[PDB]
Amino acid sequence: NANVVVRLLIRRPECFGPALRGEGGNGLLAAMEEAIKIAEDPSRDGPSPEEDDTIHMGNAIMTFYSALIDLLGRCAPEMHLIHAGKGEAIRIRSILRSLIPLGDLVGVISIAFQMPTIAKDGNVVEPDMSAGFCPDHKAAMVLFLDRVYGIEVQDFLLHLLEVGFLPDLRAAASLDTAALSATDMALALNRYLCTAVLPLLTRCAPLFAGTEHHASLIDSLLHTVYRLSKGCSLTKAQRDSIEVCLLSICGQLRPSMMQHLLRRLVFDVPLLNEHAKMPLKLLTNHYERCWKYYCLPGGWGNFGAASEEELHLSRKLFWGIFDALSQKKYEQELFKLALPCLSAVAGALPPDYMESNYVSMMEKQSSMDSEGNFNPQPVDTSNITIPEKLEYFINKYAEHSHDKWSMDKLANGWIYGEIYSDSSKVQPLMKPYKLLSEKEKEIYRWPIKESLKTMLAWGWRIERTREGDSMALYNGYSPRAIDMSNVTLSRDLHAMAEMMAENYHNIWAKKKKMELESKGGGNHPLLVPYDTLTAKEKAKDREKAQDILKFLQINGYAVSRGFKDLELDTPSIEKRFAYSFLQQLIRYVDEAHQYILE
Amino acid sequence: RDDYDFLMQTSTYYYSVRIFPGQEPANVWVGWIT
Amino acid sequence: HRTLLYGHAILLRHSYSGMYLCCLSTSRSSTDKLAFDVGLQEDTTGEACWWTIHPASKQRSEGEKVRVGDDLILVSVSSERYLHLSYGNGSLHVDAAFQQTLWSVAPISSGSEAAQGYLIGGDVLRLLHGHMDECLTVPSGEHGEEQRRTVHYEGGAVSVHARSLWRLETLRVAWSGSHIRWGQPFRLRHVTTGKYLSLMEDKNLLLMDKEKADVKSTAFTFRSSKEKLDVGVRKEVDGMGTSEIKYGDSVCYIQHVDTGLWLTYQSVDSIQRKAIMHHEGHMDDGISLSRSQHEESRTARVIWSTVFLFNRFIRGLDA
Amino acid sequence: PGQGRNNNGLEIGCVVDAASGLLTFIANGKELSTYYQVEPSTKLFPAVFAQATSPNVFQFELGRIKNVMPLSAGLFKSEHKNPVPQCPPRLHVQFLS
DSSP states (O other), rough: HHHHHHHHHSSSGGGGGGGGSSOOOHHHHHHHHHHHHHHHHHHHHSSSOOOOOOOOOOHHHHHHHHHHHHHHHHSSSHHHHHTOOOOHOOOHHEEEEEEHHHHHHHHHHHHOOOOOOOTTSSSOOOOOOSSSSOOHHHHHHHHHHIIIOOOOOOHHHHIIIIIIIIHHHHHHHTOOOOGGGGSSSHHHHHHHIIIIIIHHHHGGGGGGOOOOOOOHHHHHHHHHHHHTTTOOOHHHHHHHHHHHHHHHHHHHGGGGGGGHHHHHHHGGGGGGGGGGHHHHHHHHHHHHHHHHHHHHSSOTTTTTTHHHHHHHHHHHHHHHHHHHHSSOOOOOHHHHHHHHHHHHHHHHHHHBBBBOOOOOOSSOOTTTSSSSSSOOOOOOOSSSSSOOHHHHHHHHHHHHHHHHHHHHHHHOOOOOOOOOBBBTTEEEEEOOOSSSHHHHHHHHHHHHHHHHHHHTTOOOOOOOOHHHHHHHHHHHOOOOOOOOSEEEEEEEEEEHHHHHHHHHHHHHHHHHHHHHHHTTTOGGGGOTTTTTSSSHHEEEHHHHHHHHHHHHHHEEEOOOOOOOOOOOOOOOOOOOOOHHHHHHHHHHHHHHHHHHOO | OHHHHHHOOOEEEEEEEOOOHHHOOGGGGEEOOO | OOOTTTTOEOOOOOOTOEEEEOOOOOOOOSSSSEEEEEEESSOSSSSSSSSEEEESSSSSSSSSSSSSSSSSEEEETTOOOOOEOOOSSSSSSSEEEEEOOEEOOOOOOOTTOOOOOOOOOOTTEEEETTTEEEEEEEOOOOTTTGGGOOOOOEOOOGGGTTTTTTTEEESSSSTTTTTOOTOOOEEEEETTTTTTBBBBBTTTBOOOOOTOOOHHOOOOEEEESSOOOOOOOOOOSSOOOOOOTTTTTTTEEEEEEETOOOEEEEEOOOOOEEEEHHHHSSOOOOEEEEEHHHHHHHHHHHHHHHEEEHHHHHHHOOO | OOOOEEEHHOOEEEEEEEETEEEEEETTTTTEEEEEEEEOOOOOOOOOEEESSOOOOEEOOOOOOOOOHHHHHOOOSSSTOOSSSOOTOOOOOOOOO
């Protein structure tokens, strides 16, 4: 019944719609864009001379094309016959692929929705089902993509995840507040995700093996899915689908990539609530699959070994779960799910493990707070005052930044002059930074001072080498400055720059948060944490941190970690993990003996 | 103008090495070996 | 030998190239994304080379034999697309599209009913003249296309060269492979230069181009002898015809259709004697017909098609 | 001088006098104090040792300066009197392994 329908449809191409007639046809993606514009325009949508009587033409076109795509994808042959090699099925696949290009499907998936927003009254303004782009439209597109084209390449899988799926997941995770949970938008998006997207990513689990390059994207996927798993409006089937998808992806994932998700898990599992059941199984599976990663000194040769920070996290998780289970009243399936996790973590932990005497400081657990799951606050540096020696460095970086801005204006075509006109593209500010005035210099200087006061608040030691002093001892216009594209920092400096990038994003998070609450609506999509942010979103702040650290290095100043350990107590056997574990076990056994004596 | 006769009679040769901006010069040595 | 039936799959082989018709599956983007290009393919394997014939008129039915004169619609087996003519484009193009276009199949020749050693239409041959074996040819390849346009009788290695090869083209599209009969108009085409033999107004033979090669100027016939006994009109037979002219043994005299003049040699002295058009003609004007090998004809056509493209390339580079 | 690499990448110049065996180095247009004197008939291979702290490490420029003959003249006998610098396919970078 599918072959006959496909043959009749290709015999009469009029059934494919004006966009897909094949002559003068803009295409499926262009048809969707035109439908968006039609739905936005009031005159073209309604009759314009009874809500049921009214038909939105844009939504009707959207539904027609979605139905055609769904029908064709369902007519696509089953994979078993294709593997068997039936020439008729191969021909049907070829015809369908010729009819619908892949790029159009990717574009239509990449089209974004319109979230409901809160109002000043506290009421919710809601876009309508009857008019607009709905997730049911993308459902058919995904069905076509995974029924005729198929995702069998890791590069295609990660590109699709980056372009179409991740934004929708982030939107669903951001629509998880108390008021917006019951909105029709959120229910439709949840159904779409849990019925089409997540099962597809579950079936494409093995492709996630060799993804060391897209570590940020995989980490963002893991955080977004886990955050969505905490929603309230989610039904039993949707929750089970999310659990299956997470368990499937994490198993094929490499051990090193799970660190950021474990950071959140060690904070929520101790609660031992109903939601903790899935994290319990996830932790059990991870620590059973990657036991050689921790216990063995070398671990997997290709994978590597722990960084002692994962070991500290695992120790904290183990002890937190142990204490929480000791305090908690007996609950049969909670205990039955938690015991294997405790055993797996205990087995993974090296018995000879040395706990960090230099305990990890300045963790941003407040950023990953319990309520709202994101509290953005930077490390305030107003009390910290700048040193006098770095004034020369500040001046040099300010003039370098002014020069680069002059690069950019010359490239865009702005011309020097004496009159300031934005329309005329004439700019008196093309003069050299030395000829700039103070609060012509101040606009450059202020971010510079703030950034390294932020450095100072963290206690990092900034120093100038004797050769750095040799630099200063040695001591309109055509601007030409240092090209720092080739300069590279060490890994330690890369992590240092990453953490200031996180702080500098947190600053913008605060400013945008008070903008959010001042306007009273329109939640910004990029309000997600730094870990949840992807590479393209992170790029600007990362390169800012990179170039400031690079200029420090080039000018010869030295930046390091200002904290020093007073004494590394390696010989002490008492703080070995086995010591505390056995001592606590002995205390528990003695307590039980006294209880049974009574 | 460089003298053509001087270049024809000379036996002095030259090459140059450009360390790209970003490669620390303290980790780069230049010269001749046997 | 099997009779074609409506609804069968047929494999067309290009007679010259030897490659089979197919759907190329690589559209040139003639404003139709669904359309596919139609070209030639070397290998018979796959369903792209095969084509299905269907009745374009309700008179016929599937399984019925196909008459020589019928309208047919061809559907590619691989792409399920009709062989289509792109009306909308400024230049007419052939492509595989879902719209259908009626095609007519005209018989050219039947190999079984062809008598060996007898002249048939579309043969590449040498116009051997006299008994010293001087063949009609253009001047050699000194790269001057304008002096390539003259016609003369020459002997020697030009007989085994490719500059003395002519293709006989009938003035009829249908049954162009029929046996050539006395007094049948035709035009001679030089294979290497791609130019047709023609008579100028000043009663001199000169090659002129495809676009401007008119029938009245380029039409010639073969007559058994020199008598003034006019051929008149003989209407054509819709078949392979009767074998009359025989290679080598037969003696022919070229005569212009319109003017009635006879081809003859200049008689003024390899020999490099000029070929001239004369109404009396000399008493020794008989020619002989020698068939050319298929490899030799293909090589000459390849030479022409290559020299044209390379001349275009050189002119573009010079520009 | 210091800060010479920042504005423009250092162009260390190596000058060898085959008639005297004097090896002189020029950095950023000024002749460095370091110099060497080699024995006659010594064969000298241009060489650069580098620990890479960057995706792009360095470049081998085969140019010439004022009054100094290009390196392809000393390397190749056919180009002994050709002031135009050249990099024939025979010349190629080798590494110690």
